[PDB]
């Protein structure tokens, strides 16, 4: 194998999990110091998401400073989870909006956006809880990067017709659109990406000297999923005037 | 968490809960890409290894005297794989 590792200090994973975690309880209270829209109120889900993967590296970064750490796994599982869904509803949320745009507020009122989240979140906890509770490798591994796959490409596929109609309603009447669209593909690829690569390879190509490279900077790979969770409460959150300063 | 060694013995010695698999990978052309030994912790074996409840430990009984050393966490949220000499 190429070399052993390359792993950093646990200075490095204590600092910015407590920056995420405060940042995402300032913009939970921000949103709920007022914005009784279904919009921000989806973001609220995501912030809790970010802080959840402090905590879910917390006790992580934590124990291992010294059935007592399936807990925190299912934990940081969920976590992982629950941000990639809430990243799914925001964008599916900001599709519906834009392409219905007059029965919005007509057929999404705030009792199915309760029944939505809690619906997301309890089935978030409990897919996580199954997948570390009874699986080792090879049977629900797949599952969960096939639902990842699948969940990337249906995000890029609904921010790309937006774009689309975007350029259309332009044509009726250009770079700056294609920029935000660009920022915010390049950055969930960026940050989650090498993760479940790096998971493919754990199954697929255990020892082949070429992919054995790969995993030798695992927490260097780990570290970039720390900065999603302080790029999401600033590309989203601070992005409306509104959320600034209430 | 690197793996100490000295009709083998490796004891595993790192900041580490409970190892899932454990087990010899010698080959020449390096890895082995096919595991010659290991073991785990329900007792499946692939191919006589010794390894008393989990300890951390593993024992064969049993090319050169100069083999490799296996380790893996099976916790899906955090893989990783360790090394040895």
């Known amino acids: 194998g190429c070399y052993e590792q390359l792993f950093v200090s646990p200075e490095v994973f204590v600092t910015l999990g407590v920056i995420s975690l405060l940042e995402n309880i300032l913009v939970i209270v921000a949103i709920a110091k007022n914005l009784h829209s279904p919009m921000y109120f989806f973001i609220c889900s995501l912030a809790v998401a970010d802080m959840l993967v402090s905590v879910s590296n917390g006790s992580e970064t934590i124990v291992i400073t010294l059935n007592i750490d399936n807990v925190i796994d299912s934990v940081i599982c969920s976590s992982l989870l629950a941000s990639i869904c809430s990243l799914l509803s925001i964008a599916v949320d900001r599709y519906f909006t834009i392409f219905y745009a007059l029965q919005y507020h007509n057929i999404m009122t705030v009792k199915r956006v309760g029944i939505i989240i809690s619906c997301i979140w309890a089935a978030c906890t409990v897919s996580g809880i199954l997948f570390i509770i009874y699986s080792d490798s090879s049977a629900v591994i797949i599952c969960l990067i096939t639902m990842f796959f699948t969940m990337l490409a249906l995000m890029a596929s609904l921010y790309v017709h937006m774009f689309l109609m975007a350029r259309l309603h332009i044509k009726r009447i250009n770079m700056k659109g294609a920029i935000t669209l660009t920022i915010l593909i390049g950055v969930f690829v960026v940050c989650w990406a090498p993760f479940f690569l790096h998971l493919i390879f754990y199954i697929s190509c255990p020892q082949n000297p070429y992919c054995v490279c790969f995993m030798s900077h695992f927490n260097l790979y780990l570290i970039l999923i720390m900065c999603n969770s302080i790029i999401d409460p600033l590309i989203y959150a601070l992005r409306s005037q509104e959320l600034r300063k209430t | 968490v690197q793996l100490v060694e000295s009709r083998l013995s490796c004891a595993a010695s790192?900041?580490?809960?409970?190892?899932?698999?454990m087990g010899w990978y010698r080959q020449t052309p390096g890895n082995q890409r096919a595991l010659v030994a290991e073991?785990?912790?329900?007792?499946?074996?692939n191919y006589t290894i010794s390894r008393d409840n989990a300890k951390n430990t593993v024992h064969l009984q049993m090319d050169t005297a100069v083999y490799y050393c296996?380790?893996?966490?099976?916790?899906?949220?955090?893989?990783?794989?360790?090394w040895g000499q």
């Open positions: 073991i785990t912790k329900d007792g499946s074996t």
């Open positions: 296996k380790a893996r966490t099976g916790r899906i949220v955090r893989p990783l794989d360790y």
């Open positions: 790192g900041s580490a809960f409970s190892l899932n698999v």
